[PDB]
Design a protein around this nucleic acid. Sequence first.
RNA 1: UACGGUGCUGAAGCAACAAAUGCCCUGCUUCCAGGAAAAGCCUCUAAGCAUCAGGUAACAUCAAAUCGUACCCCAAACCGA
RNA 2: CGAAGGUGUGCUGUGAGGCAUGCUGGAGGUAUCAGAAGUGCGAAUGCUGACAUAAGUAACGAUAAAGCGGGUGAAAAGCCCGCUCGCCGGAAGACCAAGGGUUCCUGUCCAACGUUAAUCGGGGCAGGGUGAGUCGACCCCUAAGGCGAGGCCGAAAGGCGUAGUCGAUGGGAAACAGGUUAAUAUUCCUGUACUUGGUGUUACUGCGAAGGGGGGACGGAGAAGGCUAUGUUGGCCGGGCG
RNA 3: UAAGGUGAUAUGAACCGUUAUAACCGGCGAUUUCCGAAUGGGGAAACCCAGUGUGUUUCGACACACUAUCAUUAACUGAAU
Lengths: 430, 99, 18, 102, 63
Amino acid sequence: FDNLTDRLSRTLRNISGRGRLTEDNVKDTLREVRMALLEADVALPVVREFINRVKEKAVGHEVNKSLTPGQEFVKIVRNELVAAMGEENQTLNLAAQPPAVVLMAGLQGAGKTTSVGKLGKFLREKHKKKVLVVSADVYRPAAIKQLETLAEQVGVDFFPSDVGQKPVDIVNAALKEAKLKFYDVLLVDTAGRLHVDEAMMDEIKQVHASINPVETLFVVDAMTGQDAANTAKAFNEALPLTGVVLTKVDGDARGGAALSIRHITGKPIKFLGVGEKTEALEPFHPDRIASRILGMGDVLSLIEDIESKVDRAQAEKLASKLKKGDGFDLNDFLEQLRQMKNMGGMASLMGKLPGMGQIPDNVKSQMDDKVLVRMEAIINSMTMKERAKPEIIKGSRKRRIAAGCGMQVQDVNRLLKQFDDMQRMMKKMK
Amino acid sequence: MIREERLLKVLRAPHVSEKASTAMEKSNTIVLKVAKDATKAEIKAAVQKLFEVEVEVVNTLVVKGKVKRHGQRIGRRSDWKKAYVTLKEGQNLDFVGGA
Amino acid sequence: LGFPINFLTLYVTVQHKK
Amino acid sequence: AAKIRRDDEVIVLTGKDKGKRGKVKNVLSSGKVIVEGINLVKKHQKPVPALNQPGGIVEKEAAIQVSNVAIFNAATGKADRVGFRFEDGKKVRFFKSNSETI
Amino acid sequence: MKAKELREKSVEELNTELLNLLREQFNLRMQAASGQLQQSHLLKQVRRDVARVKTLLNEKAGA
RNA sequence: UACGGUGCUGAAGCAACAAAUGCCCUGCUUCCAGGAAAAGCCUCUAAGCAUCAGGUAACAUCAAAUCGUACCCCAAACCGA
RNA sequence: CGAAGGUGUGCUGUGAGGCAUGCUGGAGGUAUCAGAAGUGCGAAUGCUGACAUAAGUAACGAUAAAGCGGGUGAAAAGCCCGCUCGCCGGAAGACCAAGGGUUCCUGUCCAACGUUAAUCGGGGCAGGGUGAGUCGACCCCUAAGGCGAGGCCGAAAGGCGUAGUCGAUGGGAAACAGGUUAAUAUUCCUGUACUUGGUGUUACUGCGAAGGGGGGACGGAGAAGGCUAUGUUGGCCGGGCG
RNA sequence: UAAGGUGAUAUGAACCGUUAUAACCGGCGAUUUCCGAAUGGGGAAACCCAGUGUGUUUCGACACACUAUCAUUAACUGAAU
Ligand SMILES: [Mg+2]
Ligand SMILES: [Mg+2]
Ligand SMILES: [Mg+2]
Ligand SMILES: [Mg+2]
Ligand SMILES: [Mg+2]
Ligand SMILES: [Mg+2]
Ligand SMILES: [Mg+2]
Ligand SMILES: [Mg+2]
Ligand SMILES: [Mg+2]
Ligand SMILES: [Mg+2]
Ligand SMILES: [Mg+2]
Ligand SMILES: [Mg+2]
Ligand SMILES: [Mg+2]
Ligand SMILES: [Mg+2]
Ligand SMILES: [Mg+2]
Ligand SMILES: [Mg+2]
Ligand SMILES: [Mg+2]
Ligand SMILES: [Mg+2]
């Protein structure tokens, strides 16, 4: 699909194709996009519908004047992409009360356990709250184990029972535990050996109605895709509050149909998480995905951080002395850094997004990030004062930083200006 | 005999500058730079027809240039032209602008 | 604000190789 | 006076080399002649809008134009250009002694 | 048309690369070169093409 | 507030006297040296028109094209190197 | 295994010079004999270029003098901000024509140009910037004068000039007040208008020239009256009590 | 004629070409704005304005073609007689 999200700007071409008509720009794209889908799993029965509705509109509308059609088209395209997928209902993944019951019903494994992590993981790096997890699966091996890891490796205990093949108890057991300790949120992955899905649920049956869980979720890898539909489906009935997510994004190639099918049941998602890494999990809201043409955008996010910074120096001392008396030192510069990789200086989103308003070049984003660490290299390879008078960088005083930071000269001189010029231009206020 | 009119290619890309867009805020009057022998009357239809805009009345200018690229001796003029069209608030264009 | 501030911040880091 | 098409295992009658075969060539009438016969070293300054410095300098379009013997199944030399009947006629395309194409 | 391919009918119709067959050039007309994505082949193959067809007319008609 | 300036809001807002080389004044008076032209404009008819066309007025609407317009201008942008 | 040319040395001749050779130089040079000459400069207040001298001397362009605190910056007497101070004000202000032809505004940079320094400029390099039915030119009209079918002259070139056609410095139609841009402005916006031509509807009617008539349409000087610009005082309104 | 090419400062870019139809060289032809004898009148050369036709016409009207002087002839006219 991704490479369709290009058809996007591939479309932002006044030139147009051969057809004098350029009239076809659309339909192609349609089909084009239309293609990229099913090819990427995606069911089709539906499609007709979309592709249709799409059409429908046309012969019943026009872009309010004062606005190039081409564009409009989209709003519409986009428009229906939404509906096409998780139409619109903003999933409510946060606290109804506290603490909580995360019944994690999983078909055969696959994200089975994993998932939980970032999930939990996620919420700890969110509310003073107290997670808590439990190995709610005894058929397949590495219950705790593989999982167990993270648990600590994230600063989040968990609990289970070696070997010990029997949910319920253990579950129950767990539960009240944290509870007794009065934690805030529990996550507990489960499943069963029944070769039939009704048997799966059949299991969750007791599982559920024995515990009395508030929030319940199933999950699946796009591996299965549109097929999945059913699976989940049968259950939306079991429990409508039944919301879910799709294991592995970067973990397939089919996707679509997966999430597609879902939707088309009134299905309820909340996240998705590209795959590996303790954080790849993400919230979810059609648009969000799709954001940026067919799915993920931010920065708006990464964007909004400016506000974080820009308006925080405000935050040394906002004044912390109304004025001007010279009260701080310009090494933010490097200050920027930290934040950022400390937390969120991950690529912030710096992608750039649509080259807009001016499309400039490939290395600009494209070529420093991955590697805007370097700049850092030094800095900490220098006294405070240094960065306050970034104009006392004699060949002498620095080569040491050069080596002291481990970087053969060049790199530096070859930067010193990306500092004294930044401003230069930067500082160009009338 | 058919009128040798560049029914289509009378103009070229839009000017675009500070006045650009800020001028659009006035009456959706955009600039665009037409060729010398333009005559507003030839512009009016040029923009409204084919390019679907339904404008009304213009302005148009001229403007020259003159610089010096290489060291000595090498210099010139260049000329050009301006336009402002209008576009009533009623008949829009589903504007082809963004950020 | 978010554009320049963020874009200058961006343009600066890339240009300054160290 | 072009003496190469898609490949000519030339030699080096003179030019710091004895007989190093090669390719590229691109000899002509208004253009150059480049082959591994020669190469050099010195990179050019790259201020960074983007590091327009891929780095690595060796030959680019090294010198040495015409006046270069082309391949022969045996030793060296063997100036080409003779001419044959029909067989295209878009060029003499033959060889000295016995041969035509490689 | 192309070359000899051009000699066929007699309708000026083919001579409309300008109408709905030229609007494309109009977009990528902004200097400051903005639009580098991939095969940005914004070179004039069409305007040079406007002739030929602009020719032949007389070939058939008069000289 | 960027330090230049910005968005909002906003009172009274009259009378008396005094003037011009400006205006009535292409005037009035007077003098000898006795003070452009042509078109527009108004009007009168010729040939011609001969229930027509045209004319006048009211309003309705369309048209009013194309060049110049930046800045210096008793001066650091003009004539004096 | 270093030509010419350049710079030293030794020997040699009566001399103009010759030879050898160290250094530099990076390619050509030419015994001998004979031949053809742009064949040898210190001078011509000689031509051209380069460099001295005077001499770090005179001078730095109106005698309307400037002081200070900040800012920026490698550096500030000169640039930006501020408070003082002084100068012009029938102007040293404002607007336009003539002429100039981007000098305008923004960002930048300080080599050369600024009679010094220069972060500053009418300097460099970029961009941006002059929007009309009512202002002007085109355009109707003609002045002086120019050109001039045919025509009259004149060795040729060509001179003169009838019809006629150009030619403003003069006559012909119509817009103002607020607002706004970094820079435009009776051109853009708002509010309120106006001129002329075509077409149309209505009403009433004799229309019609390159022609006739009127009119445009015109001096100098002087003498008022009335009025407006506009100023002053009061009233009114807002503000302060030193 | 061909394995190479899109003139130069001029690279870069985007392209065109390669065992019978790029590029290049030669012949013939097409197009050839405007000013300039300049030739429709005008004119401070590159611009101002007009008469008669023409098609389209979204039927508003516009773009284009012809309209210089003079002589030979011809045709038609036609003063003072
Ligand atoms: Mg002005
Ligand atoms: Mg003088
Ligand atoms: Mg002397
Ligand atoms: Mg001294
Ligand atoms: Mg002395
Ligand atoms: Mg002295
Ligand atoms: Mg002195
Ligand atoms: Mg002075
Ligand atoms: Mg200049
Ligand atoms: Mg200035
Ligand atoms: Mg300047
Ligand atoms: Mg104008
Ligand atoms: Mg005469
Ligand atoms: Mg006249
Ligand atoms: Mg005049
Ligand atoms: Mg001004
Ligand atoms: Mg003419
Ligand atoms: Mg003439």
